[PDB]
Amino acid sequence: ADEKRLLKCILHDYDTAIRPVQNVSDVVNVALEVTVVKVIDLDEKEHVLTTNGWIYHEWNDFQLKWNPSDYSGLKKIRIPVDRIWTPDIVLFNNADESYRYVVDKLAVVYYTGKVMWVPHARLRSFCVLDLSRFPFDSQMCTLVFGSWTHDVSSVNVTLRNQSKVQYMIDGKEWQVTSVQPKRYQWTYNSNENYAGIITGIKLKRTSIYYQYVFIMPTVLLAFLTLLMPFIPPLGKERITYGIGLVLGCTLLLMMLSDRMPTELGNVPVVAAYLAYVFVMVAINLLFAIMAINMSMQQLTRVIDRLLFGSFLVLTVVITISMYAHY
Amino acid sequence: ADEKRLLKCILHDYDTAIRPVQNVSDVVNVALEVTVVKVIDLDEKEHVLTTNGWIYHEWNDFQLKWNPSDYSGLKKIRIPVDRIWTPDIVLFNNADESYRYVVDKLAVVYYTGKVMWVPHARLRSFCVLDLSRFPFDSQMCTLVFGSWTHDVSSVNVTLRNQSKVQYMIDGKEWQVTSVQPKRYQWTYNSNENYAGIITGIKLKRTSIYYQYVFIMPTVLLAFLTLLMPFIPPLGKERITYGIGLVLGCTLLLMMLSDRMPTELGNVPVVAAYLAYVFVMVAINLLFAIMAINMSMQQLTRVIDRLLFGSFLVLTVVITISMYAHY
Amino acid sequence: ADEKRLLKCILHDYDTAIRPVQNVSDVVNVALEVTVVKVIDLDEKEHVLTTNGWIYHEWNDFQLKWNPSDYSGLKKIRIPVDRIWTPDIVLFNNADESYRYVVDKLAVVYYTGKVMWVPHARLRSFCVLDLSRFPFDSQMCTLVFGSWTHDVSSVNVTLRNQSKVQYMIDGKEWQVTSVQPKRYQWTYNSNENYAGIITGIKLKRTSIYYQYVFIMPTVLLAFLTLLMPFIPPLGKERITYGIGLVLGCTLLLMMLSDRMPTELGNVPVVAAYLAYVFVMVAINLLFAIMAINMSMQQLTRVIDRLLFGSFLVLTVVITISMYAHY
Amino acid sequence: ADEKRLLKCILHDYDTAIRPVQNVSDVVNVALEVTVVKVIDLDEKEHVLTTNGWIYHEWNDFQLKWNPSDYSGLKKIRIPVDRIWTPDIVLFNNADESYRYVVDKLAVVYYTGKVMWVPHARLRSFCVLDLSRFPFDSQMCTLVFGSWTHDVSSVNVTLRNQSKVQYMIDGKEWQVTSVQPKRYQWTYNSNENYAGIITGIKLKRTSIYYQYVFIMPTVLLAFLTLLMPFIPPLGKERITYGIGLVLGCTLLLMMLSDRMPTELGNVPVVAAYLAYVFVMVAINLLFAIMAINMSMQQLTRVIDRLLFGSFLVLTVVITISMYAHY
Amino acid sequence: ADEKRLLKCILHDYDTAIRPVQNVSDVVNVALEVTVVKVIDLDEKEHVLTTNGWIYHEWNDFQLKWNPSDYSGLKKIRIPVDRIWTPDIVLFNNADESYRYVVDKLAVVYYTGKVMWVPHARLRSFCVLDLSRFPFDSQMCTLVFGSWTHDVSSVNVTLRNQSKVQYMIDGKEWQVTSVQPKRYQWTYNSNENYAGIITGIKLKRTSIYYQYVFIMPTVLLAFLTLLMPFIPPLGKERITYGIGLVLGCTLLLMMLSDRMPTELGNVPVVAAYLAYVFVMVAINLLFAIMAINMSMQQLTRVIDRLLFGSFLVLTVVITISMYAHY
């Protein structure tokens, strides 16, 4: 067949390690575009972002050149990348042992020498996230692609400006929206430059899981702690009520500590609210113990009334602040 | 032997990367049928479906052509796929790093050129599931198979209409039933088309695990919360009973939050019932605290009677609604 | 040396994909015997059985044939399986991504053409288990070995009847005993037959872990629930005692739900006993609340006496039934 | 260079599968010595021992023979094992899917034909452990190395008696000391013998983790249970104290069951002590309930005094026995 | 092209296993420098340090030698390491099964024969850590690189003194600072020396996670235990308050035991503080039980006053000591 003829012709002496430049003072312009098809997860416990997508490679191999008229058309031809040269472009913030692709067995080569690859992949990428508004947090995770072997004088990583589009994924957790990728240049020993593309995706947590697990038991334990100072001290049920709030808030803290990551810069607002509720139970237990201590003078109810007034107004302020965060 | 003769004959110049078309404007029709032998698990915590089954490949390789009379019969012959051409057909929603097969070492080739492969595999597939009726939920998970390298003008993925059958698996968890697969066409840059088969399987959770773990302690804690307002307030056991319900419902919430996934769109009905029970304990604690607060006028029992009446009728309505869900 | 001479002689034109039959209407009889050396674990949470053992292959390769007198003896010779033909026999219920062996680098070939392989392996096998008597359960897990590529007309999987022996392993968990393997024939599209061996091993759980963790706290919480109705109602300690049983039985339920698998057909007897204890605490709390409700007529002790009598006799019946299960 | 000359000379016709014997009735003596550099962990939950060390291979390859005077010295030469013959010696109790080495890329070959390998490795080995003295337990785990392909008539596994040394590792968990390795011979079908070395290492748990987590809360809950019968029954705080001990001992039991393995032969002494404390709380709750039951004759304090006396003397006996275990 | 000419010239007879020395009594000086770009995690539960960085190899291959004037410049050339010799330098304390690189597909070779490699990698390294000041602990973890095959007489591992720089990473967990690497020489059978570089990095935990999870509930439970002896004994709420502290401190202990590793040498200060709080609750429960025991002479308040005085002054001493640790 004619498809075997050009394949045996233009791969008769091809070496997969030779950089395809006609002159020694020349580079190859490798065009990249990462496109996410599905954001799988954002594991903040280990600061990884698991995602699925395809990275569009496009370079210009001048050694694979022919005219279609000698082969009766056939502009497109498909070669595995194990027999042609490929640029070593990997993630700059890879979060696993080795970088592997889902499909990497074919690459489209045109008659003008330009080569497309498009290997689909599952990318685990490190991305910095600040949990100062957990779980009502808007995020931004970056994927950095580039060459760690070839410098700028060997290859040139270029974004494609012909498709300056933006896309969105309406996940049930994250309302993922994309940011226009840019090129940022990393140096090496202040002489050699190692270029690379950077692509941000702006995650936005729209969750009903973390609200139901963390927001509503914390505000209801706050409600019970506010209901506590109407209990009269001379029956001996206020102290066991307070220690029940202590145990329930300890269980809620253990929930939160199981879910909140170690890799933490600032305290989340749900954690600060839970700490406020926990120390509020402590202060109310102090007031109950003092009240029953001098109950053995009996004009205690105005102290509990002003304590409920202060805790009511400050709890309304704190809850309104957390609602303004949401 | 004669089996070596045709193998050395029709693989004397075979290239595994050449697409087997006689004309350049021709495609190869690859027939697919996925068949599940056992659905292993549906991990909704990570939205994956682990299953075991074999995917039936069938294409037409015109380069492997011979007559049996020159080889004294032997219509069937078995070649490993590492020496012949195979289509790059993978899952469109694969949920692991790389796509691998359990057995992929043989493929049946006939004298008419048609090639069967049948590689058995363990497929981890992403599938969307809405847990609005957990755990009495009927589901539907899809397996999408197709080529991410060859377009429609190179290969053509075709369902086989000769076997339009349906099957079922009677698992102890899922009553798995199958749906007639169809073909859905995915586009690429609005010019190149990338076809593929889609196969739905309709899962149905028939579980006694999640009922015993979640349904019966929630309804029994509801029963205890309904029994609560018959306790007289002037003994100081109602408040510790209410905080015991608070701690028990917190433990049940921690059970549920351990089992309910983060990847959540809507709240499950067991979660809504547990939240209703938890806020019912909150309202009953408010009423008990108010009652013992003005116990220091003594006609409290009619308020507790009407409170039990309202909680009884609304609890019967909610439990009847959850039973109508089941 | 003479060992290289026959190796270069009878592998001078050997193809590893040719099925070794002299006539086209002939099969090769591959003799199998799986032998377990150690049953590692039975993970019922994922329905897998991890085991270690060697599978004894034995077939008849007529292409490796020589007389010892031309090579001065040397009946035994050892060839890696990468250079000779091997049958593609795998597990029919494999529970991992790919089937791999611990040692697969040598195979013994005799002068009569018969070939032994014996690759040792760690097998993860799916096996159906019914937990209707957890944890006093006698089990049976099956290992099915066969070819998914070669049919009956290509290879023939045969058990060896020369060694019809039975063995046993005295593990600290499982008293593992073996069952005589048999041959069961699986069909494919009702025309092609795909044979295979099946080997059952009869596990028997003899555990002191699950007894100490689950049986004794459940029966002691039953003992405390039986001790509950001797508490007089007019002191207000019966209700907090009952809610303490509620919280303790909730903790025990959370233990059991952590250990009991999701993949569940029937409720275990320890789970049914725990549910019975939990609803017994519910009924006793109902009776205590009613008693203290009409304590505000004072002839309550006969009701508690008959309640203890009914709960005593039915608890003795249930505990005797669970002991008869053991 | 001269280093390439002998490498091309004595590997000009080398086959990596030929067993290096001049006569057919001859074996090769492969000398083994495993040396542990660091014991990583002893996971008793899965009965594995993770360790790091190098296994010293030494055999006599008569096919790699030369005199140094023809190559101007160069007695030592270094060949990768992929081009020379190596004996297939693996662990007899391997605890992973496949046996792999950390470094296996070089092997030292001398001019006398003797070959050293020394591949460093991370070994996961099954070893039997009896937890009858957890966590004050002295242990012994074995590493068995041998050939599962070559029998005694092919290779001969030999310990080296020139280095009959013993070593020790002072870990913060295990005071690891080594035992002089010996040779134990395993049979196969009572005709073929499969030899192998066995090496015991005597672990000794010197832990402050398991003491602080398990020993001190159990003995302090024992202390609280002993303090319980001084509470007078006519205040209704003894029953809630006893149910608080029930809940605390249930939490401690859940700690222990999370840490104690399923793979259990005998109950640990900490588990027996916790069960004794738990049933002691049960007996004390029975005595408190009986006392408050006939409190409605008032000479109860001598019964509580003799009960404290019996529980004191038997608790001192049990604690002295557990201290004598330590 | 000219780039293929020298590649075919100086690799026309290259063997990848020959050590590149002109004389037999010569070594190759391999220059190493590990550089960390990001410290991923320090898992003290398994004593591993996961990090990302590149290790700078530099050796002198005299077999790859040419002048640029015969090839019109081109001093730099890039060869994959699979076709040239590379030194077998691995981690001496590797914490996984096999040592693999993220990128290892290229290596820069100059016209003077010196070869750079720079493979980026994710290193899991064992490092000793003493948790005597958890979580306010300054740490030091070491990475040891060297050859386990080539001795000092074959290769020579050398640090590069031209870059004696120090760097720092401002993580949200660890304020990572680097230490000047040195060379330490390991012996083998007291005759052969096996050199290697060692590089320390000085970690410093600056966390708000472990403080909020462990420090504040322990000090607040200490605060509640200090508030306990103002409760009058003749109401029967002191004992249930003490058992509530017992249950809350048990939950906090279970938090800590879940987070504190088994691999423990000394008790952490948070663990010692929690044990002190737990035994303080025990002593206060003893004093409350004694007080209510002889309440049935009534001058008890001075004993509780001196007990609060002693517990106040010793708690201030302990908390001031833990603050001086911080």
Ligand SMILES: *[C@@H]1O[C@H](CO)[C@@H](O)[C@H](O)[C@H]1NC(C)=O
């Ligand atoms: C790489 O391509 C960009 C595209 O604009 C260009 O600006 C830059 O100079 C190029 N780098 C080179 C030629 O080294």
Ligand SMILES: *[C@@H]1O[C@H](CO)[C@@H](O)[C@H](O)[C@H]1NC(C)=O
């Ligand atoms: C692929 O096969 C289907 C089968 O009906 C056909 O409808 C479709 O046109 C084919 N696609 C081509 C030929 O591009």
Ligand SMILES: *[C@@H]1O[C@H](CO)[C@@H](O)[C@H](O)[C@H]1NC(C)=O
């Ligand atoms: C396979 O071997 C068994 C052994 O008895 C025999 O019964 C069966 O007929 C054989 N199958 C064939 C020859 O297809």
Ligand SMILES: *[C@@H]1O[C@H](CO)[C@@H](O)[C@H](O)[C@H]1NC(C)=O
């Ligand atoms: C293997 O070596 C040991 C070393 O003493 C020897 O006793 C034994 O007989 C040898 N086995 C043979 C030669 O089969």
Ligand SMILES: *[C@@H]1O[C@H](CO)[C@@H](O)[C@H](O)[C@H]1NC(C)=O
């Ligand atoms: C290795 O290099 C160091 C660098 O100073 C040198 O001191 C040492 O002697 C060398 N080792 C040899 C030549 O064996």
